[PDB]
Amino acid sequence: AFTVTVPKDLYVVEYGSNMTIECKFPVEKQLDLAALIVYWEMEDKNIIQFVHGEEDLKVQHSSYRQRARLLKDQLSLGNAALQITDVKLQDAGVYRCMISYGGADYKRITVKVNAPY
């Protein structure tokens, strides 16, 4: 039964900082990128759609253009880490990490952004 976990389900970050939000999946021996799907979304906004070892950038909500990246050197340790640079007040909310590798699972992470001073 394929399980996604999250070591932190709540991040409190400063406005304008960078943040990396993690979700974990099981990996063994080989990781065929051909079969791996990593999806990040928040509300109705696609952040990352990673299919065949390639981020697809046509689908990515405009608010996250040039700010959102999957850390792919991490996939091999079973880490699907979303990095967001220049955190905005609108980045606050509920994120979902979906990962498929023979069947699938998703977890929720809450981000809260402290406004300046």
């Binding site: 999806y39 979304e41 696609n46 759609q49 697809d56 689908v59 979902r96 979906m98 699938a104 998703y106």
Partner: peptide, 14 residues
């Protein structure tokens, strides 16, 4: 795209 349901949340392509 495909479309996936996990514990009553769905996920599609672009």
């Amino acid at each position: 795209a495909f479309l996936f349901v996990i514990r009553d949340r769905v996920f599609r392509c672009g």
